[PDB]
């Protein structure tokens, strides 16, 4: 049967036990991507954390452990490594409302690629509209028609914000099994983590129900 | 006549039961990853499958008119297995309902403190409770034959004087009846109704209402438990409370005759459970279809 | 740009490999495969009689 | 400036010479060769224990040990004979796209999106696996790693470059920069003097580890390349692409030989490896199963269908008595 | 890489004592550890064992019951408990480590040792006490077992040990063929089934000592009588 292969299989069983007890501890944390188009304040969103290559950030809020995988220094073709983050709970997206200097459509084009991607058919997308203060300071002496000439509406902060939020939201082509949470943060807001927490707990409830079969 | 209807019902309960259970015992324990939800379904399916496997002998007995053809050891084994598994099914329904209530009312705790290890360590609870509740079966259950032979509760261990024997017998039967009605239907339905109502309240308040699937499967499980288990417990309660008169006067006889047809419906839940707890899942359906 | 020089030099060297007529290459590769087919465990069952994994 | 003019002129005369070399076809030569017959493999061991998708394996030289990399952050060194594990290396970056096994058995390489090639040391006075050097200077993501010996390694990143390192000093000693897309595969020649690299530019390049500059390029695919492997003798290499097609070249002739395709497959190739004799060409598709090709008759030979997700890596032992396939089903099956 | 033990001295018969081994310099938790003894002017005899994680524990028949053994991983210390000390126990106790996996090298390291003065299975017989030699030429030493040690799995379980005078023993070869780390590539080992041979190619001054044979197939680990290469 064995001479010390019994000791070998005992070592195998012990490290199998260690693998489970590490998988069960790495499965408690909830994972988030953090994409972005350009100078959009993904840096500022990261700076709202509590406490080369791919950089990770770990933080806990209300007895829930988070992980935020930030890519963007990875200047390469997305289609080769975007399939690694298949099981992520959410994709914290960030764009810039003051993006008329870009030489925004690039951000609008990018959102279509990641929201309608084949690996993210059932993954919620938290969306962070940034620099609302800059939008307020800028639209007062400029048209919105620069980004969208066909737009027919007033020139006021609330109307412009609603129109742009709708404009990003309707790019979603799978309206049934996803959800696009939206928020208007600034460089001074302090409830961004709270919004992310609410979105993540809603997605957790969704997943638990779909596993239990009710949903 | 219509006395064959319970015999007719059990026939469906077997063929539709073991065939359905034989799948979930396979597609959900052998050819699928191990999670808490699938382990709970696995245990429920195991209990129901063993019950349905023991069923045909009980069907034969009921057809013969409760004149046990099986031997002493077969009698003891079949009744102990049917009792333990029939209570295990109900307690596991309660456990699954409570697990879903936790997962949908406290998601943070439900992600920090539920692993397959804790599910393993906890799921043995209802089985142990079922065993301790079926403990009286070993002692009081025995094969007695008439001089002219139903497997009933004889009492010769403490038979002593037959004048005092009937007192202890009535005590034992009354205790069993009341404990059945209080810890086989009262607590389990309380838990199921309360938990599923709470998750329905939240899933209605906070959105999530895109189809009729959630508040159709939820009412399906609650109704398929109640409408199917209640009459048996009710007739059993009436029998337990009126045993004193019945064993002496036979005042109520419809209660004596309705036990078999009602027990048929009662057992039908064990063959209806998997198709309502596991087959709903899209992932499980896909896995079964691809497997075969 | 400066990368064009590297590309040009690499092309120059690739323009000087002593290529061999395909007849000899194909014949030799067929010969090697044929001479190897007698000792391929996946093909001939005989060396797969003491299969350690079974 | 105008350098594109002579660049394309050299490319055109290269094509002219290539045409001048094609005096025969494998199809014509293989006119009368007996088909290999239908082979039927079957699972022997199942190496369960991972908790996420598997992205790479590599057999040891002894043909008994193997190392598998996953996204669980673990690098398990199995024992294919008895299925019991040997080590469990916890990585500092859970994102891993490749792994390797040094010929001597002493070291194990592993890299991923962190674009640091970490060399792991197995045999030490103390009994735990330690990391020896962390090779850095790459500006992309590692795709494949291979050991020349215990002192030299070669990487291939998404920065459109492949580099030859030096484990001792940890400094790049030769950079191969002639390519133009994301490199995604390496395959050292058996004599360990020249290696290929097939990348997203729909082009395969064979280098020269001494002169440090490509000696010949290959362009025959309609899309990106995902896996390469040298033919055992050292005068050919097979390729896999996203366009459901595998191709086999030869070097001394600088042409193509055969193309393996079938109208029933529209999936992509993820890994390609040969057999000991070279008569069989394994290839792990991403339509949930692997396929077996006769590298001369061009017809399909066998099917290895045992997984429940994409087959992400496969390899063939040096002794030729086994083949192992990994899949995103968190499992690792060994065939015979 | 550094094992030191303590707890020895003088004891009274039928008494008790505790033995402790201080591990400092390697991953103690993943190494199994044993206990071996040496009566004065005698050989080696196996005593106890603990697997990694305290999963399995064995003992020696002559010390069964009255010896209990345990370890404390977080403190990196090995404990052996003396109870009811008989008289055939005065010996200087060693503290040996060993790890078990494919291709491993069990019995790699040996501690210094402490003196404890109290005032059916496999049989290995080297059948030789001393051979006289001079530096420079080869020499061979033989070992013999009771039953064939060749397990059907494929490898033979025979170890060889060296003991310089007044020093802790170290390992020369394991599995009859493989050399140990840090050993000059001039030793060698061979044999088949029951007969075993160890061959030094060219002696050096630092090789004089006593060589010990040991099996590992059946679990009671019997050693050899002792062979001395007294120059
Ligand atoms: C969900 C948990 C439990 C479910 C498991 C299966 C269902 C069983 C529960 C249904 C109710 C009890 C069934 C057992 C026996 C019945 O048939 C009936 C009720 O006691 N027995 C008699 O009427 C006794 C009449 C027999 C002859 C009476 C003659 C009296 C003198 C001779 C002595 C024989 C009877 C011993 C006590 C008087």
Tab-separated table of N, CA and C in Angstrom, chain A residues 5 8-9 11-12 15-16 18-20 22-24 26 31 52-54 56 69 73-77 80-81 83-88 118-119, chain D residues 49 51 53 55 71 74 76 83-88 92-93 95 97 113-116 127 138-141 158 182 184 200 224 226 242 310 328:
chain	number	residue	atom	x	y	z
A	5	UNK	N	4.554	6.892	1.531
A	5	UNK	CA	3.521	7.511	0.718
A	5	UNK	C	2.294	7.832	1.552
A	8	UNK	N	3.130	11.122	2.562
A	8	UNK	CA	2.958	12.003	1.411
A	8	UNK	C	1.496	12.393	1.228
A	9	UNK	N	0.590	11.419	1.325
A	9	UNK	CA	-0.824	11.737	1.171
A	9	UNK	C	-1.326	12.528	2.367
A	11	UNK	N	0.495	14.869	3.861
A	11	UNK	CA	0.888	16.223	3.486
A	11	UNK	C	-0.049	16.791	2.430
A	12	UNK	N	-0.445	15.961	1.466
A	12	UNK	CA	-1.380	16.414	0.444
A	12	UNK	C	-2.710	16.827	1.056
A	15	UNK	N	-2.293	20.239	2.891
A	15	UNK	CA	-2.261	21.432	2.054
A	15	UNK	C	-3.559	21.607	1.278
A	16	UNK	N	-4.320	20.535	1.054
A	16	UNK	CA	-5.668	20.697	0.518
A	16	UNK	C	-6.558	21.427	1.516
A	18	UNK	N	-5.464	23.569	3.697
A	18	UNK	CA	-5.024	24.960	3.643
A	18	UNK	C	-5.580	25.678	2.420
A	19	UNK	N	-5.635	25.000	1.274
A	19	UNK	CA	-6.228	25.607	0.088
A	19	UNK	C	-7.696	25.941	0.316
A	20	UNK	N	-8.491	25.095	0.939
A	20	UNK	CA	-9.865	25.467	1.201
A	20	UNK	C	-9.890	26.610	2.158
A	22	UNK	N	-7.999	28.934	2.618
A	22	UNK	CA	-7.614	30.171	1.960
A	22	UNK	C	-8.613	30.612	0.903
A	23	UNK	N	-9.224	29.678	0.184
A	23	UNK	CA	-10.260	30.015	-0.767
A	23	UNK	C	-11.503	30.554	-0.096
A	24	UNK	N	-11.887	29.962	1.034
A	24	UNK	CA	-13.031	30.464	1.781
A	24	UNK	C	-12.792	31.847	2.360
A	26	UNK	N	-10.616	34.120	0.762
A	26	UNK	CA	-10.510	34.994	-0.396
A	26	UNK	C	-11.827	35.124	-1.143
A	31	UNK	N	-15.080	41.839	-5.364
A	31	UNK	CA	-14.118	42.368	-6.317
A	31	UNK	C	-14.768	43.386	-7.243
A	52	UNK	N	4.737	49.241	-11.622
A	52	UNK	CA	4.006	49.169	-12.879
A	52	UNK	C	3.108	47.942	-12.925
A	53	UNK	N	2.153	47.945	-13.850
A	53	UNK	CA	1.259	46.817	-14.007
A	53	UNK	C	-0.146	47.076	-13.506
A	54	UNK	N	-0.690	46.135	-12.743
A	54	UNK	CA	-2.037	46.248	-12.198
A	54	UNK	C	-1.916	46.542	-10.708
A	56	UNK	N	-3.608	47.236	-6.958
A	56	UNK	CA	-4.758	46.825	-6.167
A	56	UNK	C	-4.939	47.757	-4.980
A	69	UNK	N	-9.495	46.575	-8.456
A	69	UNK	CA	-8.427	46.337	-9.418
A	69	UNK	C	-8.417	47.481	-10.421
A	73	UNK	N	-2.672	51.580	-16.779
A	73	UNK	CA	-1.258	51.533	-17.114
A	73	UNK	C	-0.938	50.365	-18.030
A	74	UNK	N	-1.877	49.441	-18.207
A	74	UNK	CA	-1.699	48.271	-19.059
A	74	UNK	C	-2.108	48.678	-20.470
A	75	UNK	N	-1.220	49.397	-21.149
A	75	UNK	CA	-1.486	49.877	-22.504
A	75	UNK	C	-1.283	48.722	-23.475
A	76	UNK	N	-2.365	48.007	-23.759
A	76	UNK	CA	-2.330	46.877	-24.678
A	76	UNK	C	-3.749	46.621	-25.169
A	77	UNK	N	-3.892	45.617	-26.028
A	77	UNK	CA	-5.201	45.277	-26.573
A	77	UNK	C	-6.063	44.656	-25.483
A	80	UNK	N	-7.525	40.721	-24.965
A	80	UNK	CA	-6.706	39.586	-24.575
A	80	UNK	C	-6.738	39.306	-23.084
A	81	UNK	N	-6.839	40.337	-22.248
A	81	UNK	CA	-6.852	40.147	-20.808
A	81	UNK	C	-8.145	40.585	-20.140
A	83	UNK	N	-10.857	39.139	-20.262
A	83	UNK	CA	-11.613	37.970	-19.840
A	83	UNK	C	-11.132	37.404	-18.516
A	84	UNK	N	-10.063	37.951	-17.943
A	84	UNK	CA	-9.630	37.504	-16.628
A	84	UNK	C	-10.590	37.937	-15.533
A	85	UNK	N	-11.198	39.110	-15.658
A	85	UNK	CA	-12.131	39.616	-14.652
A	85	UNK	C	-13.555	39.170	-14.942
A	86	UNK	N	-13.772	37.875	-15.163
A	86	UNK	CA	-15.107	37.428	-15.532
A	86	UNK	C	-16.062	37.456	-14.351
A	87	UNK	N	-15.581	37.121	-13.162
A	87	UNK	CA	-16.470	36.952	-12.034
A	87	UNK	C	-16.561	38.142	-11.108
A	88	UNK	N	-16.142	39.295	-11.563
A	88	UNK	CA	-16.172	40.486	-10.727
A	88	UNK	C	-17.619	40.875	-10.480
A	118	UNK	N	-19.045	40.386	-24.190
A	118	UNK	CA	-19.608	39.050	-24.085
A	118	UNK	C	-19.338	38.387	-22.746
A	119	UNK	N	-18.394	38.901	-21.962
A	119	UNK	CA	-18.089	38.321	-20.663
A	119	UNK	C	-18.816	38.999	-19.514
D	49	UNK	N	-8.616	20.326	-7.075
D	49	UNK	CA	-8.072	21.049	-5.947
D	49	UNK	C	-7.921	22.535	-6.181
D	51	UNK	N	-9.535	26.286	-7.331
D	51	UNK	CA	-10.789	26.957	-7.021
D	51	UNK	C	-11.167	28.016	-8.044
D	53	UNK	N	-10.260	29.403	-12.537
D	53	UNK	CA	-9.821	28.993	-13.861
D	53	UNK	C	-8.325	28.702	-13.874
D	55	UNK	N	-4.866	28.515	-16.166
D	55	UNK	CA	-4.360	29.212	-17.335
D	55	UNK	C	-3.122	28.601	-17.971
D	71	UNK	N	-5.970	31.495	-11.092
D	71	UNK	CA	-6.307	32.806	-10.559
D	71	UNK	C	-6.651	32.772	-9.081
D	74	UNK	N	-2.613	30.496	-6.449
D	74	UNK	CA	-1.877	29.310	-6.053
D	74	UNK	C	-1.150	28.718	-7.249
D	76	UNK	N	0.278	25.115	-7.787
D	76	UNK	CA	0.389	23.764	-7.254
D	76	UNK	C	1.343	22.947	-8.110
D	83	UNK	N	-1.478	11.622	-7.762
D	83	UNK	CA	-2.444	12.710	-7.645
D	83	UNK	C	-2.266	13.516	-6.361
D	84	UNK	N	-1.378	13.111	-5.460
D	84	UNK	CA	-1.153	13.883	-4.249
D	84	UNK	C	-0.242	15.065	-4.543
D	85	UNK	N	-0.547	16.201	-3.929
D	85	UNK	CA	0.191	17.419	-4.203
D	85	UNK	C	1.528	17.417	-3.473
D	86	UNK	N	2.412	18.323	-3.890
D	86	UNK	CA	3.768	18.410	-3.364
D	86	UNK	C	4.042	19.775	-2.746
D	87	UNK	N	3.692	20.845	-3.452
D	87	UNK	CA	3.855	22.195	-2.939
D	87	UNK	C	2.625	23.017	-3.283
D	88	UNK	N	2.475	24.136	-2.582
D	88	UNK	CA	1.420	25.104	-2.866
D	88	UNK	C	2.026	26.486	-2.654
D	92	UNK	N	2.195	36.689	-4.983
D	92	UNK	CA	1.919	38.058	-4.579
D	92	UNK	C	0.972	38.774	-5.527
D	93	UNK	N	0.581	38.139	-6.627
D	93	UNK	CA	-0.350	38.744	-7.575
D	93	UNK	C	-1.205	37.629	-8.150
D	95	UNK	N	-3.214	37.431	-10.446
D	95	UNK	CA	-3.426	37.425	-11.888
D	95	UNK	C	-2.219	36.783	-12.555
D	97	UNK	N	-0.904	34.519	-16.059
D	97	UNK	CA	-1.189	34.078	-17.411
D	97	UNK	C	-0.245	32.997	-17.913
D	113	UNK	N	-0.380	39.488	-15.082
D	113	UNK	CA	-0.687	40.891	-15.334
D	113	UNK	C	0.198	41.833	-14.540
D	114	UNK	N	0.847	41.346	-13.488
D	114	UNK	CA	1.785	42.178	-12.754
D	114	UNK	C	3.046	42.457	-13.552
D	115	UNK	N	3.196	41.811	-14.707
D	115	UNK	CA	4.378	41.859	-15.572
D	115	UNK	C	5.682	41.872	-14.781
D	116	UNK	N	5.747	40.988	-13.791
D	116	UNK	CA	6.987	40.633	-13.117
D	116	UNK	C	7.127	39.126	-13.226
D	127	UNK	N	12.286	24.133	4.347
D	127	UNK	CA	11.430	23.321	3.506
D	127	UNK	C	10.282	24.020	2.813
D	138	UNK	N	9.685	45.121	-17.958
D	138	UNK	CA	8.658	44.915	-18.993
D	138	UNK	C	7.526	45.917	-18.815
D	139	UNK	N	6.938	46.403	-19.913
D	139	UNK	CA	5.935	47.453	-19.794
D	139	UNK	C	4.556	46.962	-20.216
D	140	UNK	N	4.314	45.663	-20.102
D	140	UNK	CA	3.061	45.097	-20.553
D	140	UNK	C	2.505	44.054	-19.611
D	141	UNK	N	2.206	42.875	-20.144
D	141	UNK	CA	1.755	41.746	-19.348
D	141	UNK	C	2.388	40.488	-19.917
D	158	UNK	N	3.079	41.817	-23.561
D	158	UNK	CA	2.217	42.587	-24.425
D	158	UNK	C	2.816	43.876	-24.919
D	182	UNK	N	0.884	42.186	-29.875
D	182	UNK	CA	1.041	41.618	-28.540
D	182	UNK	C	1.489	40.169	-28.656
D	184	UNK	N	2.143	36.420	-27.584
D	184	UNK	CA	1.355	35.566	-26.708
D	184	UNK	C	1.830	34.119	-26.634
D	200	UNK	N	-0.197	38.661	-31.881
D	200	UNK	CA	-1.466	39.193	-32.348
D	200	UNK	C	-1.373	39.826	-33.729
D	224	UNK	N	-5.110	36.841	-35.137
D	224	UNK	CA	-4.052	36.746	-34.145
D	224	UNK	C	-3.697	35.293	-33.833
D	226	UNK	N	-2.294	32.430	-31.039
D	226	UNK	CA	-2.429	32.182	-29.611
D	226	UNK	C	-1.496	31.125	-29.045
D	242	UNK	N	-7.036	32.494	-33.749
D	242	UNK	CA	-8.443	32.649	-33.413
D	242	UNK	C	-9.358	32.195	-34.537
D	310	UNK	N	-13.823	26.141	-21.205
D	310	UNK	CA	-12.775	26.271	-22.209
D	310	UNK	C	-11.509	25.544	-21.783
D	328	UNK	N	-10.903	25.927	-17.712
D	328	UNK	CA	-11.466	26.886	-16.773
D	328	UNK	C	-12.462	26.256	-15.815
